[PDB]
Structure formats: structure tokens, C-alpha cells
Design an enzyme around this catalytic site. Sequence first.
Site, PDB file in Angstrom:
ATOM      1  CG  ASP A  43      48.823  60.372   4.914  1.00 52.42           C
ATOM      2  OD1 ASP A  43      49.894  60.836   5.389  1.00 52.42           O
ATOM      3  OD2 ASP A  43      48.362  59.313   5.395  1.00 52.42           O
ATOM      4  CE  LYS A  99      52.002  56.055   5.070  1.00 51.45           C
ATOM      5  NZ  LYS A  99      51.528  55.836   6.461  1.00 51.45           N
ATOM      6  CB  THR A 115      42.727  54.509  19.880  1.00 53.25           C
ATOM      7  OG1 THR A 115      42.044  53.449  19.203  1.00 53.25           O
ATOM      8  CG2 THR A 115      42.612  54.165  21.352  1.00 53.25           C
ATOM      9  CD  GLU A 143      48.113  46.889  11.508  1.00 56.27           C
ATOM     10  OE1 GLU A 143      49.187  46.281  11.289  1.00 56.27           O
ATOM     11  OE2 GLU A 143      48.051  48.046  11.963  1.00 56.27           O
ATOM     12  CG  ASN A 150      42.979  47.590  21.297  1.00 52.16           C
ATOM     13  OD1 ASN A 150      42.262  46.760  20.730  1.00 52.16           O
ATOM     14  ND2 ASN A 150      43.675  48.515  20.628  1.00 52.16           N
ATOM     15  CG  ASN A 165      51.400  34.138  25.957  1.00 51.87           C
ATOM     16  OD1 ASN A 165      50.940  33.342  25.131  1.00 51.87           O
ATOM     17  ND2 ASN A 165      51.802  35.359  25.624  1.00 51.87           N
ATOM     18  N   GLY A 216      36.138  36.268  46.446  1.00 47.63           N
ATOM     19  CA  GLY A 216      36.381  35.609  47.697  1.00 47.63           C
ATOM     20  C   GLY A 216      35.785  34.228  47.662  1.00 47.63           C
ATOM     21  CB  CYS A 260      36.995  27.446  45.295  1.00 52.31           C
ATOM     22  SG  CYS A 260      36.342  26.000  46.184  1.00 52.31           S
ATOM     23  NE  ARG A 289      34.362  27.142  53.086  1.00 55.34           N
ATOM     24  CZ  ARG A 289      34.356  26.070  52.311  1.00 55.34           C
ATOM     25  NH1 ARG A 289      35.350  25.188  52.377  1.00 55.34           N
ATOM     26  NH2 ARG A 289      33.371  25.899  51.432  1.00 55.34           N
TER      27      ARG A 289
HETATM   28  N1  LIG Z   1      49.838  34.360  22.350  1.00 57.15           N
HETATM   29  C1  LIG Z   1      48.804  34.743  21.569  1.00 57.15           C
HETATM   30  N2  LIG Z   1      48.908  35.895  20.871  1.00 57.15           N
HETATM   31  C2  LIG Z   1      47.888  36.276  20.080  1.00 57.15           C
HETATM   32  C3  LIG Z   1      46.678  35.440  19.970  1.00 57.15           C
HETATM   33  N3  LIG Z   1      45.829  36.044  19.120  1.00 57.15           N
HETATM   34  C4  LIG Z   1      46.400  37.186  18.684  1.00 57.15           C
HETATM   35  N4  LIG Z   1      47.613  37.275  19.262  1.00 57.15           N
HETATM   36  C5  LIG Z   1      48.411  38.380  19.093  1.00 57.15           C
HETATM   37  O1  LIG Z   1      47.864  39.624  19.553  1.00 57.15           O
HETATM   38  C6  LIG Z   1      48.550  40.660  18.795  1.00 57.15           C
HETATM   39  C7  LIG Z   1      47.556  41.602  18.138  1.00 57.15           C
HETATM   40  O2  LIG Z   1      46.877  40.931  17.096  1.00 57.15           O
HETATM   41  P1  LIG Z   1      45.386  41.275  16.577  1.00 57.15           P
HETATM   42  O3  LIG Z   1      44.582  41.842  17.717  1.00 57.15           O
HETATM   43  O4  LIG Z   1      44.898  40.097  15.792  1.00 57.15           O
HETATM   44  O5  LIG Z   1      45.655  42.408  15.479  1.00 57.15           O
HETATM   45  P2  LIG Z   1      45.773  43.957  15.708  1.00 57.15           P
HETATM   46  O6  LIG Z   1      46.838  44.297  16.714  1.00 57.15           O
HETATM   47  O7  LIG Z   1      46.018  44.571  14.343  1.00 57.15           O
HETATM   48  O8  LIG Z   1      44.279  44.459  16.163  1.00 57.15           O
HETATM   49  C8  LIG Z   1      43.995  44.899  17.535  1.00 57.15           C
HETATM   50  O9  LIG Z   1      44.152  46.344  17.614  1.00 57.15           O
HETATM   51  C9  LIG Z   1      43.136  47.006  16.787  1.00 57.15           C
HETATM   52  C10 LIG Z   1      43.307  48.353  16.799  1.00 57.15           C
HETATM   53  O10 LIG Z   1      43.331  48.999  17.842  1.00 57.15           O
HETATM   54  O11 LIG Z   1      43.423  49.010  15.763  1.00 57.15           O
HETATM   55  C11 LIG Z   1      41.883  46.634  17.173  1.00 57.15           C
HETATM   56  O12 LIG Z   1      41.027  47.271  16.476  1.00 57.15           O
HETATM   57  C12 LIG Z   1      41.742  45.269  17.164  1.00 57.15           C
HETATM   58  O13 LIG Z   1      40.586  44.890  17.507  1.00 57.15           O
HETATM   59  C13 LIG Z   1      42.699  44.575  17.864  1.00 57.15           C
HETATM   60  O14 LIG Z   1      42.536  44.621  19.118  1.00 57.15           O
HETATM   61  C14 LIG Z   1      49.385  39.992  17.956  1.00 57.15           C
HETATM   62  O15 LIG Z   1      50.704  40.154  18.560  1.00 57.15           O
HETATM   63  C15 LIG Z   1      49.003  38.683  17.901  1.00 57.15           C
HETATM   64  O16 LIG Z   1      49.872  37.825  17.548  1.00 57.15           O
HETATM   65  C16 LIG Z   1      46.641  34.202  20.775  1.00 57.15           C
HETATM   66  O17 LIG Z   1      45.640  33.440  20.751  1.00 57.15           O
HETATM   67  N5  LIG Z   1      47.721  33.931  21.525  1.00 57.15           N
HETATM   68  N1  LIG Z   2      33.506  41.800  40.830  1.00 55.15           N
HETATM   69  C1  LIG Z   2      32.847  40.705  40.392  1.00 55.15           C
HETATM   70  N2  LIG Z   2      32.878  39.604  41.177  1.00 55.15           N
HETATM   71  C2  LIG Z   2      32.240  38.495  40.790  1.00 55.15           C
HETATM   72  C3  LIG Z   2      31.517  38.460  39.509  1.00 55.15           C
HETATM   73  N3  LIG Z   2      30.961  37.248  39.364  1.00 55.15           N
HETATM   74  C4  LIG Z   2      31.296  36.510  40.455  1.00 55.15           C
HETATM   75  N4  LIG Z   2      32.010  37.293  41.277  1.00 55.15           N
HETATM   76  C5  LIG Z   2      32.601  36.804  42.427  1.00 55.15           C
HETATM   77  O1  LIG Z   2      33.516  35.724  42.206  1.00 55.15           O
HETATM   78  C6  LIG Z   2      33.611  35.032  43.470  1.00 55.15           C
HETATM   79  C7  LIG Z   2      33.400  33.536  43.284  1.00 55.15           C
HETATM   80  O2  LIG Z   2      32.033  33.263  42.961  1.00 55.15           O
HETATM   81  P1  LIG Z   2      31.478  32.045  42.067  1.00 55.15           P
HETATM   82  O3  LIG Z   2      32.598  31.589  41.137  1.00 55.15           O
HETATM   83  O4  LIG Z   2      30.145  32.474  41.515  1.00 55.15           O
HETATM   84  O5  LIG Z   2      31.166  30.894  43.126  1.00 55.15           O
HETATM   85  P2  LIG Z   2      32.209  29.845  43.722  1.00 55.15           P
HETATM   86  O6  LIG Z   2      33.378  30.523  44.365  1.00 55.15           O
HETATM   87  O7  LIG Z   2      31.449  28.957  44.692  1.00 55.15           O
HETATM   88  O8  LIG Z   2      32.600  28.866  42.489  1.00 55.15           O
HETATM   89  C8  LIG Z   2      33.901  28.950  41.822  1.00 55.15           C
HETATM   90  O9  LIG Z   2      34.743  27.939  42.445  1.00 55.15           O
HETATM   91  C9  LIG Z   2      34.212  26.596  42.198  1.00 55.15           C
HETATM   92  C10 LIG Z   2      34.958  25.644  42.824  1.00 55.15           C
HETATM   93  O10 LIG Z   2      36.164  25.552  42.660  1.00 55.15           O
HETATM   94  O11 LIG Z   2      34.478  24.793  43.580  1.00 55.15           O
HETATM   95  C11 LIG Z   2      34.118  26.387  40.854  1.00 55.15           C
HETATM   96  O12 LIG Z   2      33.727  25.193  40.672  1.00 55.15           O
HETATM   97  C12 LIG Z   2      33.346  27.350  40.252  1.00 55.15           C
HETATM   98  O13 LIG Z   2      33.239  27.200  39.005  1.00 55.15           O
HETATM   99  C13 LIG Z   2      33.749  28.636  40.496  1.00 55.15           C
HETATM  100  O14 LIG Z   2      34.783  28.956  39.860  1.00 55.15           O
HETATM  101  C14 LIG Z   2      32.706  35.649  44.287  1.00 55.15           C
HETATM  102  O15 LIG Z   2      33.484  36.451  45.226  1.00 55.15           O
HETATM  103  C15 LIG Z   2      31.889  36.440  43.542  1.00 55.15           C
HETATM  104  O16 LIG Z   2      31.344  37.416  44.179  1.00 55.15           O
HETATM  105  C16 LIG Z   2      31.543  39.692  38.698  1.00 55.15           C
HETATM  106  O17 LIG Z   2      30.962  39.751  37.587  1.00 55.15           O
HETATM  107  N5  LIG Z   2      32.223  40.742  39.194  1.00 55.15           N
END
Ligand SMILES: Nc1nc2c(ncn2[C@@H]2O[C@H](COP(=O)(O)OP(=O)(O)O[C@H]3O[C@H](C(=O)O)[C@@H](O)[C@H](O)[C@@H]3O)[C@@H](O)[C@H]2O)c(=O)[nH]1
Ligand SMILES: Nc1nc2c(ncn2[C@@H]2O[C@H](COP(=O)(O)OP(=O)(O)O[C@H]3O[C@H](C(=O)O)[C@@H](O)[C@H](O)[C@@H]3O)[C@@H](O)[C@H]2O)c(=O)[nH]1
EC number: 1.1.1.132
Lengths: 436, 436
Positions: free
Chosen positions: A30, A35, A124, A161, A214, A225, A265, A268, A331
Site C-alpha cells: 500500500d 495502513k 471493479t 463490508e 451491484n 423502498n 406485454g 396484466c 392484448r
Molecule cells: N432499504 C434497504 N437497504 C438495504 C437492504 N439490504 C442492504 N441494504 C443496503 O444496501 C447498501 C449496501 O450494503 P451491502 O451490499 O450489504 O454491503 P456492501 O455495500 O459493502 O457490499 C456490496 O458491494 C460489494 C462490493 O462491490 O465490494 C459487493 O461485493 C457486495 O456484494 C455488495 O454488493 C447499504 O446501504 C445497505 O444498507 C434492504 O433490504 N433494504
Molecule cells: N425479456 C423477458 N421477458 C419475459 C421473461 N419472462 C417473461 N417475460 C415476459 O413477461 C410478460 C408476462 O408474462 P408472464 O408473467 O409469463 O405471463 P402473464 O402475463 O400471463 O402472467 C403475469 O400476470 C398474471 C396476472 O396478473 O394475471 C400473474 O398472475 C402472473 O403471475 C404474472 O405475473 C411477457 O411479455 C413475457 O414475455 C424474461 O425472462 N425476459
Amino acid sequence: MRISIFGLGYVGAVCAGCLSARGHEVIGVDVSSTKIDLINQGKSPIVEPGLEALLQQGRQTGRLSGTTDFKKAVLDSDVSFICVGTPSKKNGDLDLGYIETVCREIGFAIREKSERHTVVVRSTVLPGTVNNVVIPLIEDCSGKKAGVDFGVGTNPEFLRESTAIKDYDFPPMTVIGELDKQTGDLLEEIYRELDAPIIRKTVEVAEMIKYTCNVWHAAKVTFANEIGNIAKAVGVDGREVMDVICQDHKLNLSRYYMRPGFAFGGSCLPKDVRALTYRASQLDVEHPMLGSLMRSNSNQVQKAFDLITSHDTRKVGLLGLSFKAGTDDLRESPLVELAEMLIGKGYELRIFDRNVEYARVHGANKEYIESKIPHVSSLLVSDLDEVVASSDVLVLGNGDELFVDLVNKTPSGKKLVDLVGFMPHTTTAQAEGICW
Amino acid sequence: MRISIFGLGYVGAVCAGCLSARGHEVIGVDVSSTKIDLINQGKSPIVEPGLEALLQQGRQTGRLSGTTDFKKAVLDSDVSFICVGTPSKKNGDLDLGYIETVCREIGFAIREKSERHTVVVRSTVLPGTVNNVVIPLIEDCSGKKAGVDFGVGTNPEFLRESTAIKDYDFPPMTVIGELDKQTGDLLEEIYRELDAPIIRKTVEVAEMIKYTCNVWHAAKVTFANEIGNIAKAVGVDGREVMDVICQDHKLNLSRYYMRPGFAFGGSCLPKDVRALTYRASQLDVEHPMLGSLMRSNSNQVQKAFDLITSHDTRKVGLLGLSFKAGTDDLRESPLVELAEMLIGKGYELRIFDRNVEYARVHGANKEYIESKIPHVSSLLVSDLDEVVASSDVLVLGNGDELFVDLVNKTPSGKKLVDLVGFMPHTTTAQAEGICW
Ligand SMILES: Nc1nc2c(ncn2[C@@H]2O[C@H](COP(=O)(O)OP(=O)(O)O[C@H]3O[C@H](C(=O)O)[C@@H](O)[C@H](O)[C@@H]3O)[C@@H](O)[C@H]2O)c(=O)[nH]1
Ligand SMILES: Nc1nc2c(ncn2[C@@H]2O[C@H](COP(=O)(O)OP(=O)(O)O[C@H]3O[C@H](C(=O)O)[C@@H](O)[C@H](O)[C@@H]3O)[C@@H](O)[C@H]2O)c(=O)[nH]1
Ligand SMILES: OC[C@H]1O[C@@](CO)(O[C@H]2O[C@H](CO)[C@@H](O)[C@H](O)[C@H]2O)[C@@H](O)[C@@H]1O
């Protein structure tokens, strides 16, 4: 193994501690003498549970030391992990300053080293950084060539962290960006005992994976949120709502919906997104992320249109019309939207959809098909072979298994536009993907 | 049971098939003579794998029938499911037109029946619809009272078109919105045999859960597409990237990050979001969703500030300063940002954070803590009891276990602002949550 680590910060100090605890001989490097001095005292420069003990253990066993002598560090190690900062520039872009300095230092260091050295980037960095920055600098400062003279690779970290050591011990996966096989093998050896997959990819894929992880984490928080804010505004507990969402490992917490492809699409998703965001607006709850979905979605339709219209021909065959394979539901089908865009621009469109074709004969949707969207339904062709034969550009619109053969053995003189992921590999002169 | 189903479309026709196949007597009601005629013939109105067979089976066994006679349908059943359309109005809001007429029809039919009837809304409707639209209309037209004279509940559906029967048979979960216990019990009995959890909540929570599921699905697709677009632009297969993301069941596909609460921060998420979106912009890849994250995030910081300053007092105690419990890292901590906003507006701020307090005098960040942000660090107080006693508003900023006692046994005369989720329940006069 003998290992040097450049950068003893939140990531580097933990790696130093964890590697030395597994028996490696580690030299931490470093530019900060603060450190370095703490590490040599067996002191953690940071508050991170369990770290001080690991550093203490490393000093006691003689397997960990800290220095500013980068040359010595490189000469006395087989591999250098780069763990220096990659903070934002004022404009939000990636600041490469520290990466650049370290690369020059390592290059100077290996210039006269006769044993093959290996350089591994854990920091990164954006896709392209190793090819355009790391390699050129090390090559220019060493007078040596990447690959044959020195090893180069990347190895992103997924540590959080406050739980870094546990995260190191039990990661979700180990990701390796590979150039020369020797370095990939070296990294595999270091991580081999961890109970998680070792995933070897190109450097560019590896770095994209890290950023995607990330940004996904950020997207998850933002979603929770915004939903939470809306829940509170309608008088319910946002945590209760999200708790239930998280009990669904079939759709919510699975890989379903996570495939890059075309716009969503159907009957729903679009209406339910519009309704919830409308309500949020009525309740004065700002929701930038939820409020961006429909625009992004419409953008994806335009993107497909642009790929299709880039080929100097008017003859387009659209494979799939209803919003999903296996249903006749039209639809808010993005394929119908696409079809209408093509028709509006004067394209000679032919359409195949066996479900919609069936629905014209059997079912309760005949009036819609023949009277509401006649301009589109009149372009239905019942024979897939005929759509293929008479079209120049073929658009794979939805997931019908009947389209597999066309992709496996495409007739000559045809261009494919893959919106779903039928292609086995990336874009070629004859077939292009919307996200590959 | 004797069940009537209002609306024999993509959802209702499936429910009719699946319920009759399980031994229930099903009377399908629709205003469409076309759909009723098809059901009475044992024919599917839609293309949906396996449905026609179920409908044939129901007619053959005498358990299934279709009619436009809503009065008779109600008289000859004990529970009615509402499965009518809830399309968008032109402005994107929920169109209540079909649910309103069905409620009036059902209301008039129950006026003509002495025995207790039960009404269950399966159609997706916004939080508040049952209480403000459904109940009033049924009560008005029947002259009877909700819960007491007729059962009322919701039961959102999670079926996907093209796999609807498989989804009915093997759902992730059954969700019930409950007013009167009898209706909840009735729904539980219908779904007991399924291999999934039964979740009984208030009507509003049930309604919110359904929307959240669909908008989450939309968000997942949008994320995959935007990342895919960026991936293609950097010369990589977006599907390969996302495939790897989906191998991580610890952070990516788990409930981590899915709790409503405060802005994300720290040394990596913000900078990596900024860097990736910056690169996307350079590559002319539009990314509305990814480009919205930082704004939503800053909005969440403002939301907390707004809650804090709504109390007519300047004495604020901030519990937590570094970005997470268990670490001292202050880099882009949302709590430091919040503190500075409060200082800037003249608040009397006291701060507790055991990690930063330790780091201030031991470790490698002293100079930052002492010389860069002394306007914040000088407000640190060693004793949690002192921050509490001297402040009127106490802000629960990060997840330190020490804050649990304060929440379970709060001294009188305090207002808590919970940014994390320590509160057992929802907002009261003395404690308020950012998303509850
Ligand atoms: N609102 C909300 N905030 C959250 C939640 N969980 C975590 N956070 C927040 O997300 C932020 C990041 O926290 P975390 O991902 O636990 O720790 P860190 O930022 O050190 O790690 C991330 O960056 C690393 C890195 O690039 O070095 C990654 O390696 C790692 O996996 C994380 O994505 C913080 O502000 C947290 O408070 C949640 O459920 N809800
Ligand atoms: N790009 C991408 N598009 C995706 C993927 N998986 C699904 N889709 C698309 O997501 C759209 C919705 O498809 P899907 O959720 O499989 O079927 P559906 O729209 O009938 O069902 C959703 O609405 C229902 C409802 O409200 O009645 C839900 O009940 C249900 O769970 C689904 O969220 C379609 O346009 C798909 O092509 C994916 O991995 N990638
Ligand atoms: O509640 C008394 C009465 O209800 C029944 C069914 O009508 O049981 C219901 O309520 C029970 C108590 O909450 C639940 O255990 C049961 O699951 C539910 O069906 C009868 O069993 C009982 O006599």
C-alpha cells in the site's frame, strides 16, 4: 503460495487476512504507511468483525507482512492481486488513476524478474479496462508481453463490508475473467476448496457480471423502498408486503423474468404497472424507478424495430404474434405493436402464429381478430415454411419450439432478428440478437 | 361446494375448469353469449393447454355449466368469485366499470336470497377498492351488511397465461384477503390440498401484495433487458451475464436487499451504478430504469429528512452514522448526508455510532473523521443513554442490535423515526416508519 496484494483497504485487508489464514505467504502493498504499520502490528485498519484476529494470526505465523516496496513484493510473490480503489470521478465515470499507477509499478517490477509473474485484478473495473489500460501499461513498463511473458486475469469480489470474512469463506460463487489458461488455473487452485461454483469466463463477461450484481442489488433496494413508500401511503406495512413477496421462490425469487430479451406485454403486467404508478401519483408518492418501466419497455420495442429496419429490405416475416408462446392472447402484445410499426412504415409483413390462427376458427376472440385488428390478422400465414421462404428478415418474437429448427439450419439469403434467445451464440452476419 | 364464477375469460375459464375438476359444482356467469355457449359445449374460449379437457370433463360429469342469468347463479351457489376485467382507463388508472356492474348485480341477487352468500374478489383491484367500492355497492343494492349478512374477501390469482393450469395446481402460495372469518375459512378449505403456504392477511395487504408481485415481475424483465442492451453494446452475450447472476442464491436471488427502508450507500453500490450508467450513456444505450436509481435513492434521503423535521423541535438524535452496522465505513453514507442536511437547517444534532467512535481514535481513517467531517464527527456522543435523554426525535439509521431495547422500551416524550424496521408494528403517534 506466495501472494502480493496491492491495496490494503476494506477489500484488500480482508483478502490478505483470509489468504494468510489458509496458509499462503502474503505480502500486502500500500502507498499508505499508516495502513502498512497497522498491519505489521497485527492491527486492523478498519472495523470489520474477526479481521484483527486474522491479521494477528498472520503476523504470528510469519505468513503476513506489509510494505511500500512494490518491487520487492512482486519479486517475492507468484501472483499480485490488485485491490486498489476505483472511485467515481466528479462526473460519475470510473476513476482509473490508482489502477494505472499500480500497473506501471508492476510493469517496472517484472522487467527484470526471470520467473513468470501473474497479475490479477480484483478491483471493479469496466469491461475493456484490462485490454485497453492494464495490459498496455504493464507491457510498456516491462518490455514484456501479456500471455507468454506474464499472466493476466480478473477475479471480482462479492464481499460485503461488516460480513467480509464470512462472505469470503462462503461466497455465492467465484468468478474468473480469463486470458491465458495458466492464470485461470492458478486462481482455480486458490479457490478450489470453497463450496461454490468456480465460473471461468472472458474478462469482459466477468467485469459485466460484477457490475450487474451491484446494480441488481441497488435495483432491489430501490424497488423495496418505492413499494414501501406506496404501502405506507395506502395505510399498510411495506415490510409485511415485501415479506410475502419473498415467500415466492417460483416467480419472485427465481430466475424467471431475468432473461434479456423483448418488452413485456400481455393483459396484466402493463395495466397493473400503470395502475399502481397512477395511484402512487395520486398519493404524492414519487417513484422514479417504477415510473420508468413503461418507457424502458417502449424503448425495447423501438430497439427491435431499429434492428429490423437496418437491412435494406421490405420483406419481413414475424414469427409469433400473441404475447407468449402457447396462448392466443393478443392484448398489449409487443409483437402486435411491432407489426403495426412495420405496417406504418410500409413493410411487406407476413406473420406466423399457430395459436392466433387456431383462435380465428375456435374460440371467443374471433371478433377482435377479424374486426379490431384486421390490418394485422389479414397478414397471418398458416404455413411457417411459406413465411420463411417469402421473407428476407425473420423475427423470432416469442418462445415457440417450432422456431428452433429455423435457427439450427437457416436457409440461405435470410437474416434473423432474435428477440427471445434462440441463437446458440452471439450476433453474426446472418443472425443478430437484441441483447447478444 | 357450489361455486359461481363471474367472468369466464383467461382467468375465470381456468378457475371454472380447475374447480369443477376438483369436485365442486361450478356455475360460470358471463355477459358474453359466445363464451357461455362454448362452456356449455365443453369448449375452451381460449388457447390454454389442457383447459378444453377440463371443461369437457366438467360438462360430462354435470358439475359445470354456463349462464347469463346472474340471479339464478347466485341463488344456486354459496360462493361467487369475481373474475371480471380490470383494464386501464385511457389515463392509465384502474377501470372499475366491470367490477361495479357485477357488484350491483350480485347485490340485487343476494337481496332475493335469505341464506348467507359469500363474495370473493379474484380480479386484481387497487388497495381500497373492496372497502370503498365493492362493499358499498353490494350493501346499497342488497340492503344487507358486509361480513355480517354476506361474506366478503379477496383472493388474488397468480396464474400465468399458457401455464395457467399448472400454475393453479402448483402455485407459489395462496393469498387471502380477509374480513369475516367464515369467508377466510371457506377459501382455506378450497385451497388446503395444494402444496403451498396459505397466507391470510387484511384485504388491503392482499391487494398490495398482488400489485407488488406484478410490478416486481415487470421490474425483473426491465432490468434484464437494460443490462442485456449494455452487454450487447460492450460486445458480450447478455444472456451469459444474467445466467451467472441467477446462480447466486445468497444475494441476487434471495430476500437480501428486499426490505423497505432507507437509501443505499457505501463505497461501492453508488459508484458502480454511476459508472455503469455513465458507460451506457457513452455507448448510446438508453437505460431509463438503471438511470432512475440514484434519483429514487436521493428521494429516500429527502423522505427521511421530511419525517424528522415534521415535529416542531430541533433536538435530534441520530442512531447510526456509518453506512451499515458493524463497520466504520463512512463513504457515501446516507446517514452522513442526512446529518449534514440537518446541520445545514440548524438542528441540534447528537450522534451515536460505536464503530465510528472507535475508528476516530484507532485505525486508518482518523484524519478523515477528524479533519474532513469534524462538523459531523464532533457531534458524536459515547453514551447511547445520553443521545436518547437529550434528544426529542430519535432516528434509527442502521441495524445495530443496541437500538432494539430503545424501541421495545421507549422513554416517554420521544418521537422515533425508524429508517430500518426495528418497530414491531406500524406508525403510531410516538413512532413512525419510513415505509410502515
Ligand atoms: N432499504 C434497504 N437497504 C438495504 C437492504 N439490504 C442492504 N441494504 C443496503 O444496501 C447498501 C449496501 O450494503 P451491502 O451490499 O450489504 O454491503 P456492501 O455495500 O459493502 O457490499 C456490496 O458491494 C460489494 C462490493 O462491490 O465490494 C459487493 O461485493 C457486495 O456484494 C455488495 O454488493 C447499504 O446501504 C445497505 O444498507 C434492504 O433490504 N433494504
Ligand atoms: N425479456 C423477458 N421477458 C419475459 C421473461 N419472462 C417473461 N417475460 C415476459 O413477461 C410478460 C408476462 O408474462 P408472464 O408473467 O409469463 O405471463 P402473464 O402475463 O400471463 O402472467 C403475469 O400476470 C398474471 C396476472 O396478473 O394475471 C400473474 O398472475 C402472473 O403471475 C404474472 O405475473 C411477457 O411479455 C413475457 O414475455 C424474461 O425472462 N425476459
Ligand atoms: O371457528 C369455529 C368453527 O370453524 C371451523 C370451520 O367452520 O374451523 C375453522 O376455524 C378453526 C379455528 O380458527 C380453524 O382451525 C379451522 O381451520 C377453520 O376451518 C370449525 O372447525 C369450527 O367448529
